């Protein structure tokens, strides 16, 4: 159906095509650099709030632990 995740305030006509690669390729290229800060944030979240930032395989059927301090 109507994919509207963008507002109707600034839509225009088609101005750019596929001049060099696809967005998926750039996303795959930049995930390499994005990797480590995600791990740091995940560890910090685990030590403060167990289920805020999640692993990709801890969704519908994932179990979270609890810490031994509530500060």
Partner 1 sequence: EALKHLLVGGNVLLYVSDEGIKVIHLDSYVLCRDPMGNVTEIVVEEEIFKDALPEEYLDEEDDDDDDMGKKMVKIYTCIKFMDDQCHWYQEIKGKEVPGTHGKCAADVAPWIALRQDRVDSEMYGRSYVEQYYGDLLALENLYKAILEASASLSKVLFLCNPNGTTRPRTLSQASNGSIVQGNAADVTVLQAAGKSQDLQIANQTIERIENR
Partner 2 sequence: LAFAFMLNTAIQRPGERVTAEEIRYMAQELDAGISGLYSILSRELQLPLVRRLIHILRRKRKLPDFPRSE
Closest alpha carbon to 23 in 31, 34, 33? 31
Of these partners, partner 2, partner 1, none, which one is at the site of residue 5 (CB under 5 to 8 Å by kind)?
Answer: partner 1
Of these partners, partner 2, partner 1, none, which one is at the site of residue 47 (CB under 5 to 8 Å by kind)?
Answer: none
| Of 7 and 36, CB closest to partner 2 | 7
The kind and range of the H/E element at 31 are: helix 23-48
Judged on CB neighbours under 10 Å (0-12, 13-18, 19+), 71 is exposed
Of the residues 2, 4, 10, 11, which one makes contact with partner 2 according to CB under 8 A: 10
| Of 49 and 64, CB closest to partner 1 | 49
């Amino acid at each position: 159906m109507k994919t509207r995740l963008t507002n109707n305030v600034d839509r225009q006509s088609a101005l750019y095509g596929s001049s060099g690669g696809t967005a998926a390729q750039r996303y795959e290229q930049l995930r390499v650099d994005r990797n480590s800060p995600l791990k740091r944030a995940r560890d910090c979240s685990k030590v403060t709030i167990p289920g805020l930032i999640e692993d990709e395989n801890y969704g519908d059927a994932g179990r979270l632990d609890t810490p031994y301090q509530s500060s």
